[PDB]
């Protein structure tokens with residue numbers, strides 16, 4: 109079938125700041141496939157700067173190197189080193205003549221700002237049906253955040269679930285003290301601590317997960333299928349935060365699941381991708397059927413309403 113690709117550079121609804129810099133926009137590639145009868149398919153390739161080794165420029169080069177027509181064999185030549193590209197082409201191909209997709213509103217995790225702000229930001233989300241939250245930690249001193257956490261756990265309604273995200277900012281000693289605190293004062297409301305240590309300290313990450321009672325989730329540590337596989341083979345007992353748009357061919361996750369990966373240990377999250385990628389992911393969720401709130405409560409930075417009509421895709425494409 110014939111295909112086309114177009115780059116996109118979209119300003120974020122509002123700036124997002126991390127320890128690796130500040131970004132005011134998200135860029136990527138949109139793929140449009142069309143068969144001999146006029147049926148169309150769409151896909152999105154959007155690697156996230158800093159996450160993994162794949163770069164948008166490498167994806168663009170791939171797109172310029174591929175033949176004017178697509179086939180399963182041709183797409184099989186896409187380098188394993190370009191997981192977002194594998195995702196984009198795979199989802200694009202599968203969507204040909206299948207849009208729009210049947211999807212559903214899975215529970216979404218609500219984010220809570222660092223500091224005391226967490227105590228005033230959960231109410232609105234809870235009143236909108238969100239029962240899982242993720243609070244950013246490792247910003248203030250451990251003592252200060254622990255005091256806030258005690259108050260937060262006491263204030264949250266029965267049934268609330270809370271995730272703590274350290275964004276790999278704690279050093280080994282601080283992480284150890286935190287888990288000791290959680291082991292004691294932690295409420296059955298703590299779902300897990302996300303990335304307590306930076307990815308380079310994998311031995312410490314594994315050791316902590318194998319010894320502390322509070323569950324640990326890998327995020328920054330797991331971008332591609334290759335990294336997830338590596339952690340599965342290392343015997344990771346915790347959770348895996350899967351960013352499907354950056355992962356690779358969706359079939360690779362299904363293969364891992366048929367093997368040593370536990371479905372209950374997965375949390376599907378956003379890589380600040382567009383509506384095409386997000387809708388493709390929700391389509392995939394009809395099969396994987398998540399059992400934890402999705403880390404897609406990122407509307408503040410990038411809103412991407414699910415696409416419910418084929419014309420909606422066409423409009424997005426033509427607007428470029």
Ligand SMILES: [Mg+2]
Nearest residue numbers: 273302303327
């Ligand atoms: Mg995280």
